[PDB]
Amino acid sequence: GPAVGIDLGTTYSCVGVFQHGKVEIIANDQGNRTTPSYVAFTDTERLIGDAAKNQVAMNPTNTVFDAKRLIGRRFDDAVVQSDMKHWPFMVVNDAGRPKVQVEYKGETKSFYPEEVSSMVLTKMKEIAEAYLGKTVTNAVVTVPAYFNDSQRQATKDAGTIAGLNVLRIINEPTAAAIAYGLDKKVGAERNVLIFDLGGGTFDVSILTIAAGIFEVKSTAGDTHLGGEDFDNRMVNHFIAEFKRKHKKDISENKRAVRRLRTACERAKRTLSSSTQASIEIDSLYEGIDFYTSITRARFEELNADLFRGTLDPVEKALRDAKLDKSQIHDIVLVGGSTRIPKIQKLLQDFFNGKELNKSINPDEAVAYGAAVQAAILSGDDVTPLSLGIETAGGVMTVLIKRNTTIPTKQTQTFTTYSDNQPGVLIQVYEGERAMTKDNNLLGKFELTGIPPAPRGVPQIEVTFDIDANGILNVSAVDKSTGKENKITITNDKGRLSKEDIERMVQEAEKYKAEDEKQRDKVSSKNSLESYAFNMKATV
Numbered sequence: 291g292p293a294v295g296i297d298l299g300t301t302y303s304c305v306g307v308f309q310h311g312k313v314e315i316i317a318n319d320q321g322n323r324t325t326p327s328y329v330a331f332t333d334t335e336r337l338i339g340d341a342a343k344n345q346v347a348m349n350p351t352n353t354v355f356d357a358k359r360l361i362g363r364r365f366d367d368a369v370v371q372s373d374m375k376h377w378p379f380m381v382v383n384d385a386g387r388p389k390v391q392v393e394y395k396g397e398t399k400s401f402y403p404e405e406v407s408s409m410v411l412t413k414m415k416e417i418a419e420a421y422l423g424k425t426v427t428n429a430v431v432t433v434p435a436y437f438n439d440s441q442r443q444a445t446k447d448a449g450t451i452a453g454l455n456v457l458r459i460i461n462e463p464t465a466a467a468i469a470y471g472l473d474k475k476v477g478a479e480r481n482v483l484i485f486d487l488g489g490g491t492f493d494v495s496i497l498t499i500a501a502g503i504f505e506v507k508s509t510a511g512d513t514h515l516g517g518e519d520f521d522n523r524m525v526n527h528f529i530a531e532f533k534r535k536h537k538k539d540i541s542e543n544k545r546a547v548r549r550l551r552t553a554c555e556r557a558k559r560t561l562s563s564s565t566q567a568s569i570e571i572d573s574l575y576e577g578i579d580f581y582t583s584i585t586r587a588r589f590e591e592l593n594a595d596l597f598r599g600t601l602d603p604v605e606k607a608l609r610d611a612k613l614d615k616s617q618i619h620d621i622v623l624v625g626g627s628t629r630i631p632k633i634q635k636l637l638q639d640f641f642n643g644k645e646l647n648k649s650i651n652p653d654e655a656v657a658y659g660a661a662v663q664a665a666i667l668s669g670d671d672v673t674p675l676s677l678g679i680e681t682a683g684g685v686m687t688v689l690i691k692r693n694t695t696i697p698t699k700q701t702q703t704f705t706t707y708s709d710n711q712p713g714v715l716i717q718v719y720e721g722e723r724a725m726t727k728d729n730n731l732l733g734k735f736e737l738t739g740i741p742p743a744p745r746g747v748p749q750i751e752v753t754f755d756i757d758a759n760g761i762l763n764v765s766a767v768d769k770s771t772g773k774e775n776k777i778t779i780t781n782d783k784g785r786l787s788k789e790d791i792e793r794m795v796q797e798a799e800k801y802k803a804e805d806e807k808q809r810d811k812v813s814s815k816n817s818l819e820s821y822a823f824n825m826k827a828t829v
């Protein structure tokens with residue numbers, strides 16, 4: 291009946307469903323609300339989820355994980371080549387694509403990353419079906435905001451292979467914002483910072499929500515920073531302590547290191563709520579029992595550099611979004627590692643004591659929002675687009691930013707581009723792209739009779755006026771003569787849907803770097819030509 295929302299993560303995945311007016315995070319066959327993104331191949335069977343991770347020490351060369359780091363990418367990507375050196379399983383090239391290679395029932399088998407992701411999605415689908423007691427078909431799957439079209443199509447194909455109808459691919463930070471209802475808040479546009487610290491990845495996203503529209507302003511972070519690194523800091527600390535007390539290095543014994551790491555991770559999770567935790571391991575190495583403790587302050591000291599360095603991607607995302615820290619309206623914690631009190635204190639002090647949105651389980655908020663969006667897609671006055679004019683080089687110069695309260699009036703001064711320019715062609719465009727090629731022409735009019743003058747000397751005042759009904763009047767005045775011209779543009783008729791605005795905003799997101807590189811190509815910013823650039827001859 292209902293559609294599910296799936297957070298397909300690198301190490302863990304989550305599935306939720308909106309029923310009875312409530313989002314429910316679905317527990318698996320072992321009772322866990324999150325399922326490891328592991329696929330294991332043995333002599334007899336294919337294990338997925340908890341069963342696959344529970345035997346990783348026994349079958350490490352045939353237990354696949356972190357397949358999300360490969361999906362949508364080609365084999366010769368530097369990211370893939372760098373990640374291959376850290377995995378116990380083999381990665382091979384097949385016509386320019388990476389594949390994981392394992393042994394299964396005594397035969398060598400290779401799978402594309404989307405195939406392993408399809409196995410994980412099959413597990414999540416079966417979990418949802420066991421919970422709901424019916425076949426689940428429609429689903430919303432989330433991806434990192436920095437995913438390109440290829441990676442998103444690969445994730446959708448992974449969904450399709452698993453028998454899922456992928457209604458839509460949405461961004462994980464957007465899903466986290468939807469779970470908190472930040473798109474349903476009253477007032478002007480809101481700036482949202484999603485701080486996502488999981489088991490092995492760290493993602494900072496800066497979005498702007500305006501009239502229910504999500505625009506990804508910036509993304510940053512560290513693809514190899516998570517709770518596993520904190521566990522490893524603890525493990526090295528305790529190995530040093532054991533070597534210092536009992537004069538023995540336990541690094542030689544793999545099982546001792548495994549037991550120590552499990553104890554350290556559990557003690558870390560304890561330290562999120564207590565100021566100290568105990569480590570009790572019987573016969574850790576050479577019969578010696580290891581019974582010790584660790585304070586929260588010592589744990590923070592062991593991870594001081596990583597904890598404090600989480601703030602640098604925040605600064606980078608703020609700079610790339612052209613926003614001050616005080617301009618952020620909402621802060622959303624996602625990922626289990628955000629339960630660490632020192633991380634929360636660092637983030638809150640950085641924002642001068644602002645409260646953090648953390649009431650939703652940070653391991654489940656992405657699947658929460660995905661389920662909300664799946665239920666929406668299954669059944670559950672401001673300006674819509676930026677308005678501007680074409681300036682020299684055919685670039686878009688915006689006078690009324692998107693999501694501006696009407697009625698409004700905005701005036702800007704422009705000038706001529708060539709010497710002795712007799713007139714200017716005011717060309718009104720609507721869109722979120724830097725070049726007028728990729729925007730929508732609404733109208734144009736000419737302003738002639740400009741007295742001969744050098745370039746940059748004449749002054750042309752251009753005014754955009756939007757009344758309460760949305761009727762757009764654009765006027766141009768020669769400031770040296772008072773001569774004027776104008777045009778009226780009917781901004782009505784329901785010509786745009788919410789999906790149209792979302793598509794235009796996401797296309798502006800996709801070509802952000804090229805739009806920036808071509809916007810600053812022209813030297814002057816308020817120079818008007820006399821012709822239409824998009825109708826000029828080019829090779």
Ligand SMILES: N#Cc1ccc(COC[C@H]2O[C@@H](n3c(NCc4ccc(Cl)c(Cl)c4)nc4c(N)ncnc43)[C@H](O)[C@@H]2O)cc1
Nearest residue numbers: 302322324488489516517518558559562626627629630653
């Ligand atoms: N069951 C279960 C389960 C639930 C969620 C996750 C995902 O966790 C990913 C990252 O989140 C880390 N983490 C988590 N993870 C949530 C979690 C909850 C319960 C269990 Cl049994 C486990 Cl072990 C993990 N809690 C933390 C905490 N309280 N303090 C510091 N770090 C915590 C976790 O150690 C890892 O670094 C993994 C397992």
